[PDB]
Structure formats: structure tokens, C-alpha cells
Amino acid sequence: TPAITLENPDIKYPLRLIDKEVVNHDTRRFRFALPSPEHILGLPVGQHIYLSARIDGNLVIRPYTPVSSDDDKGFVDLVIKVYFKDTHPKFPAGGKMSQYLESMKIGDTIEFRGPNGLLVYQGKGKFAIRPDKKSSPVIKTVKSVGMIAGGTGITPMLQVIRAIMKDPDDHTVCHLLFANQTEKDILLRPELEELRNEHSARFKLWYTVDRAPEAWDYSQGFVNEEMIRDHLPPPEEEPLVLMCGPPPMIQYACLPNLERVGHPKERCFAF
């Protein structure tokens, strides 16, 4: 195989920022060079990395979930929302690591470590999911997967979606319900709709927004029972249901409604 970057999850690897693209008003794609154009990251599908830096006198470590893969030689892509200072009344300082990243110049470096996470997608419908950090993975193969993502919670979902669509022999059908605050907050919309246009048989796409625009053909509001019933596969088909987003989205919007619809806890996983 190609040379792997992340050889031990406790080792730190400083990677150089080589590109940055605006995703929307507050979110960006940050691309970092791997140690050589021929290296791969070493990232089982579904796992994340951690970035670390000393910021204003404190150690700051944060996980980010690459949207690229081990097919992508020489680089790694992160999609990261910046939490700006002087914007939200409850958080006047903004976010530490995200603003630090936003301030980086091309050529600056930051330390990566990983990979980590309880879920690994092994292809052709097969998921290896550890109950916790100290247990063996349980191998669950499914015909379909429900995905509930809020905001930047789209990142692990997009890793899994892209891995599936690349393999013409992977017949797994993904049903994504993607929640954001407003229409302009819908991250990577062109990418998602390109995936729908090209893989409609394996990819079902639905949105909800807190605040909807005039003409809107999808859903509005926090994730609810109706959305889960109509836009994720039915419990009878025993799909896995994956969730990723703000903790209250998971706690108050997803879990009780997955219960109402009839998806058993055993079939559900939160990143």
C-alpha cells in the first residue's frame, strides 16, 4: 500500500495548510498536505482526527472529521465551521480552535493525531461498531442506512456516503436528513445534490431548516417525528440509523422521535 501518515494514534504529525475554500459565510474547507504526495492519511471510513495547539496560553485539542479518504493521495480535507467572536451574545469570545484555524496562513502547520472513533465502515454495507472504547467491534451489515446530520455533523456522514458511492458493487442505500439553521447554512449543498443527481437509487436526500425561505420544498423546524418517518428507511427494513450534530439535537430531536417511529436503540449510533 501507499505510505501511511497516522501510524500511531498517540503520535503528533505537523501538517502544512495548502488550501482553503469558502463553504459558506462561516464554514470552510481546509486542505493540508500529507508528508509526501504519495502518502495517504491512514483513515478507516467513519473515523476522525484531533488537532492540537497552544492557544492564548492554554492547550486546545479538538476533533475534526476528514471528508477526504485514503484514495486521496497527498492531502487531507477538513470542513470546519468558524465560531466568530463578537457575534453570538451567549458566546462573545467565539470558538478557540476554529478561530485559530481561520487565522492560519497558507504554509502554517498544526499537529494532527488519530484516527479515532467507535465506528468503521468496511464497505458493502458492513459496519464495525464498538460499544465503547474498551470493547471489540460488533459487525453489522445492512441494506440501508439512515443518516441524521445537523450542521457540521454532515462530515462523518459525507465520509460514509462517498465511500459507498465509489463502489459500484456497494448496494447500500443511504437516506440523509440534513438539518441547518437557514438555507444559506446548508453545507456542501452542491456536492450533496450532485450525489443525488448521480446516485439517486442509493442516495435519498432531505433537508430541514430552522427558518425557511419563501419558496421551500423541504422541511422546516427542528428534526421531528414526521421527518424521521418519511425520510429514513422504516424500522421494518432494519436499517442502521446514524446521527451526528449538536448534543440537544441528538437528545431531544432524534432519540425520542426514533423511539416514536420504532427504531430500536440497538440499530442507532451517535458519532
Ligand X SMILES: NC(=O)c1ccc[n+]([C@@H]2O[C@H](COP(=O)([O-])OP(=O)(O)OC[C@H]3O[C@@H](n4cnc5c(N)ncnc54)[C@H](O)[C@@H]3O)[C@@H](O)[C@H]2O)c1
Ligand Y SMILES: Cc1cc2nc3c(=O)[nH]c(=O)nc-3n(C[C@H](O)[C@H](O)[C@H](O)COP(=O)(O)OP(=O)(O)OC[C@H]3O[C@@H](n4cnc5c(N)ncnc54)[C@H](O)[C@@H]3O)c2cc1C
Please list the active-site residues.
48, 64-65, 244
Closest CB to ligand X among residues 65, 172? 65
Question: Is 81 marked as binding a ligand?
Answer: yes
Spell out, one character per residue from 128 to 147, where the chain touches ligand X: x when CB under 6 A holds, - when not.
--------------------
Find how far residue 23's CA is from the centre of its chain. Answer: 14
Any contact of residue 181 with ligand X (CB under 6 A)?
yes
Which of 13, 30, 32, 64 is in the footprint of ligand Y by CB under 6 A?
64
Least distance from ligand X to the Cβ atom of residue 120, Å: 13
Any contact of residue 243 with ligand Y (CB under 6 A)?
no
The string of DSSP codes covering the chain is -PPBS-SSTTS-EEEEEEEEEE-SSSEEEEEEE-SSTT-B----BT-EEEEEEEETTEEEEEEE--SS-TTSTTEEEEEEE---SSS-TT-TT--HHHHHHHHPPTT-EEEEEEEE-SEEEEETTEEEE-SSTTS--EEEE-SEEEEEEEGGGHHHHHHHHHHHHH-TT--PEEEEEEEESSGGG-TTHHHHHHHHHH-TTTEEEEEEESS--SS--SEESS--HHHHHHHS--GGG--EEEEES-HHIIIIIIHHHHHHHT--GGGEEE-
Question: Is 147 marked as binding a ligand?
Answer: no
Residue pair 257/224 in contact by the 8 Å Cβ criterion: yes
Q: CA-CA distance, 164 to 265, in Å (whole number)?
A: 24
Which residues in the 57-96 window bind ligand X by CB under 6 A? 65, 81
Residue whose cell numbers read 470558538:
95
Give the count of beta carbons closer than 10 Å to the beta carbon of residue 266. 10
Least distance from ligand X to the Cβ atom of residue 53, Å: 18
Any contact of residue 91 with ligand Y (CB under 6 A)?
yes
Which of 5, 47, 98, 155 is in the footprint of ligand X by CB under 6 A?
155
Any contact of residue 151 with ligand X (CB under 6 A)?
yes
Which of 210, 226, 237, 266 is in the footprint of ligand X by CB under 6 A?
210
Question: Is 16 marked as binding a ligand?
Answer: no
Closest CB to ligand Y among residues 19, 38? 19
Closest CB to ligand Y among residues 115, 233? 115
Any contact of residue 123 with ligand Y (CB under 6 A)?
no
State the residues that interact with ligand Y by CB under 6 A: 48, 60, 62-65, 78-81, 83-84, 87-88, 91, 94-98, 152, 155, 271
State the residues that interact with ligand X by CB under 6 A: 48, 65, 81, 150-153, 155-156, 179-181, 210, 222-223, 244-246, 248-249, 252-253, 271
Binding residue numbers for FAD: 62-64, 79, 81, 83, 96-98, 155
